[PDB]
Amino acid sequence: DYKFWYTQPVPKINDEFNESVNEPFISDNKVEDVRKDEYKLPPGYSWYVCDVKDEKDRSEIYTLLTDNYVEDDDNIFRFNYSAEFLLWALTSPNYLKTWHIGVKYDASNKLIGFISAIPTDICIHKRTIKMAEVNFLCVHKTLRSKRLAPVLIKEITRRINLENIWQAIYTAGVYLPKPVSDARYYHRSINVKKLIEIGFSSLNSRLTMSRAIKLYRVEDTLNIKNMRLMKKKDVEGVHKLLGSYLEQFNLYAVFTKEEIAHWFLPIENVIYTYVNEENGKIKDMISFYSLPSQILGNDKYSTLNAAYSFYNVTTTATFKQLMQDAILLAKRNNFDVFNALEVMQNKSVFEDLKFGEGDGSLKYYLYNWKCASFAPAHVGIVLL
Numbered sequence: 001d002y003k004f005w006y007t008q009p010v011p012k013i014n015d016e017f018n019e020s021v022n023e024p025f026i027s028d029n030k031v032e033d034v035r036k037d038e039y040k041l042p043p044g045y046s047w048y049v050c051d052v053k054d055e056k057d058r059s060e061i062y063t064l065l066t067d068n069y070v071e072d073d074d075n076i077f078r079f080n081y082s083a084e085f086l087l088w089a090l091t092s093p094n095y096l097k098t099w100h101i102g103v104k105y106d107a108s109n110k111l112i113g114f115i116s117a118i119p120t121d122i123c124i125h126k127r128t129i130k131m132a133e134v135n136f137l138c139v140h141k142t143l144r145s146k147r148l149a150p151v152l153i154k155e156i157t158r159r160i161n162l163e164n165i166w167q168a169i170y171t172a173g174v175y176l177p178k179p180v181s182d183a184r185y186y187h188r189s190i191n192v193k194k195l196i197e198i199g200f201s202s203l204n205s206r207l208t209m210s211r212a213i214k215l216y217r218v219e220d221t222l223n224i225k226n227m228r229l230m231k232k233k234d235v236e237g238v239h240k241l242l243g244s245y246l247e248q249f250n251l252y253a254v255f256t257k258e259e260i261a262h263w264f265l266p267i268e269n270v271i272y273t274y275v276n277e278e279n280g281k282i283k284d285m286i287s288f289y290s291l292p293s294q295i296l297g298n299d300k301y302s303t304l305n306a307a308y309s310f311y312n313v314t315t316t317a318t319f320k321q322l323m324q325d326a327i328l329l330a331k332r333n334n335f336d337v338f339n340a341l342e343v344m345q346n347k348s349v350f351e352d353l354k355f356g357e358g359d360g361s362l363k364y365y366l367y368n369w370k371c372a373s374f375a376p377a378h379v380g381i382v383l384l
């Protein structure tokens, strides 16, 4: 019934809009009218302002997500974003501490809830809008189905509106009103014995262990011999290469040079970016972020080490040769699997590079924005 979602400026389950429609649900919003009072929490619960730059606050958020965040459809895996990933994800340029919102249970003084936003310029159907990207919504497992989530959502909405920002972007595995795009995820095995042992992957009588291993073997040589970790000097080159590539899509963030530096400069165990420089010019780029999963109840392994395709552009190779190199660089950095969504040009290489179709899909939503939906090939933004 979406008793909560139907009260919000998002499309109804049956709404479809033509390609020309591209506008807010509610316009002419006035900052001066935004409620100034915090949304009421149940008795015994309080808002808490997280300082993600403070290691101990950051560690509380970490512990909350580790224990209570998103699981795969069979509840075999749970996302285990690292503390250093959270810091990177949450302190991008012009970020507001005030958009990093915790809920504590007063008597234990423990964090039981969290939601966060960061500001981003989003171009939707060629209109660039100041938006907030919402992420890390989490309610403790002991407190599910008590309608806390709408309170967290209303409170971040109010705080976003205070900054005169009226649109948001978010992604979920769950179906809500109403996705502007739906993207399946696909997986390319690197450490197949491990994937076989934890049941990320399966064998049959055609496919013995040694045959599966051979299938997914890769040559330890790049197609683009000079692909190297990105360095500060490459920032303008990356801003030029990526900013222009992205113009082609129907939904993409507009990056400043300061954002390109934040989002791409390598950080071990968080973000990996490689570039191919041809006489001072950045001609190709590969990026992926590190997002391990906790393996629940497996005697041998605790962690699934996984690389997540971020942004990839080539002008000197084929997209297939570029993504092959992506897989090889993931393998070199001890990732067990390389994951991609069917956005941008990615689907075109999945068959040949031996990706398998996953279990489900990631839905893209906008808040307070009416437009035509589109196939995932036209989505040019990957969230964290």
Ligand SMILES: CCCCCCCCCCCCCC(=O)CSCCNC(=O)CCNC(=O)[C@H](O)C(C)(C)COP(=O)(O)OP(=O)(O)OC[C@H]1O[C@@H](n2cnc3c(N)ncnc32)[C@H](O)[C@@H]1OP(=O)(O)O
Residues within 6 Å of the ligand: 001, 002, 003, 004, 005, 006, 068, 069, 070, 071, 132, 134, 135, 136, 137, 138, 139, 140, 143, 144, 145, 146, 147, 148, 149, 150, 153, 156, 157, 160, 161, 165, 166, 167, 168, 169, 170, 171, 172, 173, 174, 176, 367, 368
């Ligand atoms: C202008 C700026 C605007 C700013 C805001 C933009 C919008 C941002 C929206 C947020 C974007 C986040 C993106 C992001 O973080 C990435 S998607 C990951 C969300 N987190 C998880 O899945 C972690 C594990 N699950 C949980 O922690 C709980 O199940 C959560 C807290 C998800 C729901 O708590 P609960 O204890 O299970 O449920 P109740 O409290 O009783 O509440 C039920 C209501 O919550 C609706 N619900 C459930 N999951 C949702 C989800 N993933 N988005 C939006 N709504 C969701 C549900 O449909 C229902 O409403 P309805 O009755 O209408 O159907």
Ligand SMILES: COc1cccc(Cc2nnc(-c3sc4ccccc4c3OC3CCNCC3)o2)c1
Residues within 6 Å of the ligand: 070, 071, 072, 073, 077, 078, 079, 171, 173, 185, 186, 291, 293, 304, 308, 309, 310, 339, 340, 341, 362, 382, 383, 384
């Ligand atoms: C293997 O462990 C898990 C744990 C929880 C949920 C899943 C299912 C799933 N839920 N979202 C995604 C994916 S696959 C992928 C590939 C490339 C880039 C992004 C993603 C992605 O979602 C990202 C971004 C949105 N927030 C979650 C991670 O995958 C698998």
Ligand SMILES: [Cl-]
Residues within 6 Å of the ligand: 154
């Ligand atoms: Cl209300």
Ligand SMILES: [Cl-]
Residues within 6 Å of the ligand: 300, 301, 302, 303, 304
């Ligand atoms: Cl392990």
Ligand SMILES: [Mg+2]
Residues within 6 Å of the ligand: 139, 143, 144, 145, 146, 147, 148, 149
């Ligand atoms: Mg609840």
